[PDB]
Design a protein around this motif. Sequence first.
Motif, PDB file in Angstrom:
ATOM      1  N   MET A 191      -6.699  -2.805  -1.369  1.00  0.00           N
ATOM      2  CA  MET A 191      -6.772  -1.670  -0.453  1.00  0.00           C
ATOM      3  C   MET A 191      -6.043  -0.412  -0.927  1.00  0.00           C
ATOM      4  O   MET A 191      -5.850   0.511  -0.125  1.00  0.00           O
ATOM      5  CB  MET A 191      -6.287  -2.107   0.933  1.00  0.00           C
ATOM      6  N   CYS A 192      -5.648  -0.351  -2.199  1.00  0.00           N
ATOM      7  CA  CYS A 192      -5.110   0.840  -2.841  1.00  0.00           C
ATOM      8  C   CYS A 192      -5.576   0.842  -4.284  1.00  0.00           C
ATOM      9  O   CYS A 192      -5.851  -0.217  -4.852  1.00  0.00           O
ATOM     10  CB  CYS A 192      -3.586   0.806  -2.929  1.00  0.00           C
ATOM     11  N   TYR A 193      -5.657   2.033  -4.873  1.00  0.00           N
ATOM     12  CA  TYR A 193      -5.891   2.154  -6.304  1.00  0.00           C
ATOM     13  C   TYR A 193      -4.615   1.842  -7.077  1.00  0.00           C
ATOM     14  O   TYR A 193      -3.501   2.097  -6.608  1.00  0.00           O
ATOM     15  CB  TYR A 193      -6.298   3.579  -6.663  1.00  0.00           C
ATOM     16  N   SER A 194      -4.787   1.300  -8.288  1.00  0.00           N
ATOM     17  CA  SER A 194      -3.637   1.113  -9.167  1.00  0.00           C
ATOM     18  C   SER A 194      -2.856   2.406  -9.349  1.00  0.00           C
ATOM     19  O   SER A 194      -1.634   2.375  -9.516  1.00  0.00           O
ATOM     20  CB  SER A 194      -4.092   0.564 -10.523  1.00  0.00           C
ATOM     21  N   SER A 195      -3.539   3.546  -9.298  1.00  0.00           N
ATOM     22  CA  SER A 195      -2.941   4.850  -9.547  1.00  0.00           C
ATOM     23  C   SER A 195      -2.270   5.481  -8.330  1.00  0.00           C
ATOM     24  O   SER A 195      -1.695   6.563  -8.472  1.00  0.00           O
ATOM     25  CB  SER A 195      -4.014   5.807 -10.066  1.00  0.00           C
ATOM     26  N   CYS A 196      -2.334   4.866  -7.145  1.00  0.00           N
ATOM     27  CA  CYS A 196      -1.867   5.549  -5.933  1.00  0.00           C
ATOM     28  C   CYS A 196      -0.399   5.951  -6.050  1.00  0.00           C
ATOM     29  O   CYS A 196       0.471   5.106  -6.278  1.00  0.00           O
ATOM     30  CB  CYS A 196      -2.066   4.668  -4.698  1.00  0.00           C
ATOM     31  N   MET A 197      -0.117   7.239  -5.874  1.00  0.00           N
ATOM     32  CA  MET A 197       1.258   7.706  -5.981  1.00  0.00           C
ATOM     33  C   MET A 197       2.082   7.206  -4.797  1.00  0.00           C
ATOM     34  O   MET A 197       1.591   7.104  -3.666  1.00  0.00           O
ATOM     35  CB  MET A 197       1.329   9.238  -6.147  1.00  0.00           C
TER      36      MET A 197
ATOM     37  N   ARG B  67       0.823  -1.197   0.000  1.00  0.00           N
ATOM     38  CA  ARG B  67       0.000   0.000   0.000  1.00  0.00           C
ATOM     39  C   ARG B  67       0.864   1.257   0.000  1.00  0.00           C
ATOM     40  O   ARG B  67       1.995   1.268   0.500  1.00  0.00           O
ATOM     41  CB  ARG B  67      -0.938   0.002   1.201  1.00  0.00           C
ATOM     42  N   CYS B  68       0.295   2.329  -0.551  1.00  0.00           N
ATOM     43  CA  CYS B  68       0.978   3.590  -0.749  1.00  0.00           C
ATOM     44  C   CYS B  68       1.166   4.319   0.583  1.00  0.00           C
ATOM     45  O   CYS B  68       0.604   3.921   1.610  1.00  0.00           O
ATOM     46  CB  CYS B  68       0.181   4.445  -1.738  1.00  0.00           C
ATOM     47  N   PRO B  69       1.972   5.392   0.603  1.00  0.00           N
ATOM     48  CA  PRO B  69       2.253   6.067   1.882  1.00  0.00           C
ATOM     49  C   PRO B  69       1.027   6.666   2.534  1.00  0.00           C
ATOM     50  O   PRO B  69       1.024   6.863   3.754  1.00  0.00           O
ATOM     51  CB  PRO B  69       3.279   7.140   1.496  1.00  0.00           C
ATOM     52  N   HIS B  70      -0.008   6.984   1.755  1.00  0.00           N
ATOM     53  CA  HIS B  70      -1.254   7.448   2.344  1.00  0.00           C
ATOM     54  C   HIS B  70      -2.048   6.296   2.944  1.00  0.00           C
ATOM     55  O   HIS B  70      -2.427   6.338   4.119  1.00  0.00           O
ATOM     56  CB  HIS B  70      -2.116   8.157   1.302  1.00  0.00           C
ATOM     57  N   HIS B  71      -2.324   5.264   2.145  1.00  0.00           N
ATOM     58  CA  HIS B  71      -3.250   4.238   2.605  1.00  0.00           C
ATOM     59  C   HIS B  71      -2.668   3.386   3.727  1.00  0.00           C
ATOM     60  O   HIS B  71      -3.425   2.900   4.579  1.00  0.00           O
ATOM     61  CB  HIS B  71      -3.746   3.389   1.438  1.00  0.00           C
ATOM     62  N   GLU B  72      -1.343   3.211   3.782  1.00  0.00           N
ATOM     63  CA  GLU B  72      -0.797   2.443   4.899  1.00  0.00           C
ATOM     64  C   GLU B  72      -0.990   3.154   6.233  1.00  0.00           C
ATOM     65  O   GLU B  72      -0.880   2.506   7.280  1.00  0.00           O
ATOM     66  CB  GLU B  72       0.675   2.068   4.684  1.00  0.00           C
TER      67      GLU B  72
HETATM   68 ZN   LIG Z   1      -3.135   3.965  -1.888  1.00  0.00          ZN
END
Ligand SMILES: [Zn+2]
Length: 196
Positions: free
Chosen positions: A142-148, A80-85
């Motif tokens: 739990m993340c979008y494919s696009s998550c930066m 998961r990306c730095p936001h979603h984690e």
């Molecule tokens: Zn994400």
Amino acid sequence: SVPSQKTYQGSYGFRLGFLHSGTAKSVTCTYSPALNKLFCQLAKTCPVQLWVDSTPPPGTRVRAMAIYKQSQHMTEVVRRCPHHERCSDSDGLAPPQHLIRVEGNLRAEYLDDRNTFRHSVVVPCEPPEVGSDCTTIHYNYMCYSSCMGGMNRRPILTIITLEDSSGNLLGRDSFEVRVCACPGRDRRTEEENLRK
Ligand SMILES: [Zn+2]
Ligand SMILES: CNCc1ccc2c(c1)c1ccccc1n2CC(F)F
């Protein structure tokens, strides 16, 4: 360094199946056989069927793991990306870093591999309910494919492995995944692109 993605039915005839959900704008999860690709919304239920020709032994398990599809990214752990984690959406069992969760199974176990650092989620392989011909696992992405800073628009594959009680391989299947806001439209677009 890179998990195998070779389809392998094995002794039990293991393979996946998917529902036929269509491509309406309102659909939350839809599978493209032509693309071998699942399209789903963030954190929504993704039903994946497990089919076998014969019953595997007690203690058999089913593991899911994500890898990047492109060879130049395949050694990078999918997370998961730095936001979603950090968004505190824990279900009480899945580590916040894990992309793939199993919904509604208190026997799910989440592994951080001590050597590869890859994430996976594993459940006991259970027989179909009386009246059913297959078993269904409900996954969430739990993340979008696009998550930066995470997947960052890079396509992923989910690898599903049937394993014995020691973790040895009994069967393997896989599918591409795109986690996106409008899976019906994106499936239609990619299928038309393939046809052209
Ligand atoms: Zn994400
Ligand atoms: C006609 N229905 C066949 C069928 C399909 C899937 C089945 C089984 C049987 C079965 C039997 C024992 C334990 C697990 C079983 N599964 C889940 C496995 F595919 F992951």
